Amino acid sequence: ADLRALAKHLYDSYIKSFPLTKAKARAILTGKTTDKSPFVIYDMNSLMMGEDKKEVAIRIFQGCQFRSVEAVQEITEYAKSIPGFVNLDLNDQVTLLKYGVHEIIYTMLASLMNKDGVLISEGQGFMTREFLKSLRKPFGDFMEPKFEFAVKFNALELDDSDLAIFIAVIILSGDRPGLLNVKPIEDIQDNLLQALELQLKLNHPESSQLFAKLLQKMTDLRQIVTEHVQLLQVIKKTETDMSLHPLLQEIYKDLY
Amino acid sequence: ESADLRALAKHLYDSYIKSFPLTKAKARAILTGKTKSPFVIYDMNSLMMGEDKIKFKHIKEVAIRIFQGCQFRSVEAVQEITEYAKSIPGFVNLDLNDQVTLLKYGVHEIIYTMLASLMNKDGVLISEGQGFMTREFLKSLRKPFGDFMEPKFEFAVKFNALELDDSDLAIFIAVIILSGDRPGLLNVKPIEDIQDNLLQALELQLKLNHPESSQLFAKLLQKMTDLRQIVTEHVQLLQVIKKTETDMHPLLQEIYKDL
Ligand SMILES: O=C(O)c1c(Sc2ccccc2)c2cc(Cl)ccc2n1Cc1ccccc1
Ligand SMILES: O=C(O)c1c(Sc2ccccc2)c2cc(Cl)ccc2n1Cc1ccccc1
């Protein structure tokens, strides 16, 4: 079904839509001379220095929300290039985005993570995992599930060209709640799955059942989203003067 | 290693037959009505007579009685799944702590997978095919019980649209059990080595058993996302039912509190 051209089309659109690729993320993280070293936020003192180079825990959590809004915009731009996506019923285009966007944010956040922390500000900073664990409850563990996923996910050693197809497979899920026309979505995903299987065969010939192992990770992705909405509710129960961005309000209402 | 992937599939199907008395083929021969015939539980009157007619190990307000009956049966299911697990080549040679971990986290997923075999859009087979409880009758139960089975009916309708048979499911259940991502595993290596052979066996099985069915392997694997979700929301529903229901023997409590 011209699976190689489709693989490449997706990869090009992914490079067009997302400003920080995994290749660049890894080059920054491992001190390559193609890129610049990051400023490191590891405690309250360096955070305050990082923000220039009321409560800090709420302010970090809010920063993450805002970068997530830009991330939703990038995802949506990417999704328009997925062949067939813009031809679907408009309500279905909304539904697929509403349910897929966090699973994609988390997939792609793995690209910015190692076991010790996460790239921030398109890779200009690096915030440590230990600093994030040190924040006030309930904010001291909101990133832990994402780190634990990133470590496992990153062991698959996927590259940008593998990830572009994988993210498209995620968006085109005909099992999302409240879809009107399931069949045209499954037809699209069928092609994307074929392209993914072929991409992994060619790109990882020595890697047994990599296709299967990647699809199984979709399970972890969904549980992160599930846990995250549980955490949001705990924050709603226990926190007061706390504002949520309109775009995120729409996504979360009423997700799971 | 095609011939032995086929032997593995045949071996697993044979053990599945041995371990699970009510199979999908049998459940389907009842649900489509292909002939015994089930006693129907469509309302409170029929429930009452059903309890007198069918055996029931559970024979308290109705919604409670049903939910405890379900738990009692789930505990029975765990021992069938455990027996089956022990027939998966390599499983009984794993570190004992790891066997326990795989079963602890795997049984729930397997219970819901196999419950789909007993279900259609209209209701569920109960007591070994001897009964049938309507989906509508479950919805009518008072909150929080009216909403408890609905997500499972949702899952089953999407899962059953794959049209898997017992031979497919035998290998799929094994794949579920041998997951190297369960927390607290000591030795992930042999677990993933077994799962790898099982995945290869499953891939071939689906290709041969469903030649006209594109990306069925992939679609089945992605069904695991909705499965885990069902399980997570079920456990939190139990951990609200428990904390809030007064109708829920100390000795019996000990047996049935966990799966
Ligand atoms: O602005 C950012 O790039 C950023 C932020 S914003 C921020 C970071 C440090 C100090 C203040 C704000 C962020 C926060 C967390 Cl807890 C985790 C990851 C974060 N990132 C990186 C990120 C990348 C993709 C999607 C969301 C966030
Ligand atoms: O005892 C049973 O066979 C049964 C029960 S027990 C029961 C059924 C109807 C009325 C009273 C008790 C059950 C209950 C729900 Cl709400 C759903 C499925 C159920 N089943 C069928 C079942 C099969 C496998 C695993 C769990 C349950």
Swiss-Prot record, chain B:
RNA-binding found in the keyword field: no
Domain NR LBD as annotated: residue spans: 4-258
Domain remarks: The 9aaTAD motif is a transactivation domain present in a large number of yeast and animal transcription factors.
Source taxonomy: Eukaryota, Metazoa, Chordata, Craniata, Vertebrata
Motif (9aaTAD): 250-258
Assembly and interaction partners: Interacts with FOXO1 (acetylated form). Heterodimer with other nuclear receptors, such as RXRA. The heterodimer with the retinoic acid receptor RXRA is called adipocyte-specific transcription factor ARF6. Interacts with NCOA6 coactivator, leading to a strong increase in transcription of target genes. Interacts with coactivator PPARBP, leading to a mild increase in transcription of target genes. Interacts with NOCA7 in a ligand-inducible manner. Interacts with NCOA1 and NCOA2 LXXLL motifs. Interacts with ASXL1, ASXL2, DNTTIP2, FAM120B, MAP2K1/MEK1, NR0B2, PDPK1, PRDM16, PRMT2 and TGFB1I1.
Gene designation: PPARG
Binding sites annotated in the UniProt record for rosiglitazone: 71-74, 108, 234, 256
GO cellular component: chromatin; cytosol; intracellular membrane-bounded organelle; nucleoplasm; nucleus; receptor complex; RNA polymerase II transcription regulator complex
Tissue and organ expression note: Highest expression in adipose tissue. Lower in skeletal muscle, spleen, heart and liver. Also detectable in placenta, lung and ovary.
Induction of expression: (Microbial infection) Expression increases when incubated with M.tuberculosis or its lipoprotein LpqH; induction is TLR2-dependent (at protein level).
Regulation: PDPK1 activates its transcriptional activity independently of its kinase activity.
Known function: Nuclear receptor that binds peroxisome proliferators such as hypolipidemic drugs and fatty acids. Once activated by a ligand, the nuclear receptor binds to DNA specific PPAR response elements (PPRE) and modulates the transcription of its target genes, such as acyl-CoA oxidase. It therefore controls the peroxisomal beta-oxidation pathway of fatty acids. Key regulator of adipocyte differentiation and glucose homeostasis. ARF6 acts as a key regulator of the tissue-specific adipocyte P2 (aP2) enhancer. (Microbial infection) Upon treatment with M.tuberculosis or its lipoprotein LpqH, phosphorylation of MAPK p38 and IL-6 production are modulated, probably via this protein.
Processing after translation: Phosphorylated in basal conditions and dephosphorylated when treated with the ligand. May be dephosphorylated by PPP5C. Ubiquitinated by E3 ubiquitin-protein ligase complex containing FBXO9; leading to proteasomal degradation. Ubiquitinated at Lys-18 by TRIM55 leading to proteasomal degradation. Ubiquitinated by E3 ubiquitin-protein ligase STUB1/CHIP; leading to proteasomal degradation.
Family indicated by similarity: Belongs to the nuclear hormone receptor family. NR1 subfamily.
Record-annotated membrane-spanning stretches: none
Full protein segment contained here: 235 to 504 of 505
Keywords: Activator, Biological rhythms, Cytoplasm, Diabetes mellitus, Disease variant, DNA-binding, Glycoprotein, Isopeptide bond, Metal-binding, Nucleus, Obesity, Phosphoprotein, Receptor, Transcription, Transcription regulation, Ubl conjugation, Zinc, Zinc-finger
Pathological association: Defects in PPARG can lead to type 2 insulin-resistant diabetes and hyptertension. PPARG mutations may be associated with colon cancer.
Cross-link (Glycyl lysine isopeptide (Lys-Gly) (interchain with G-Cter in ubiquitin)): 18
Compartment(s): Nucleus; Cytoplasm
GO molecular function: alpha-actinin binding; arachidonate binding; chromatin binding; DNA binding; DNA binding domain binding; DNA-binding transcription activator activity, RNA polymerase II-specific; DNA-binding transcription factor activity; DNA-binding transcription factor activity, RNA polymerase II-specific
Annotated protein name in UniProt: Peroxisome proliferator-activated receptor gamma
Keyword Isomerase attributed: no
Consequence when changing residue 71 to P: In colon cancer; sporadic; somatic mutation; loss of ligand-binding
An individual GO BP term: negative regulation of connective tissue replacement involved in inflammatory response wound healing
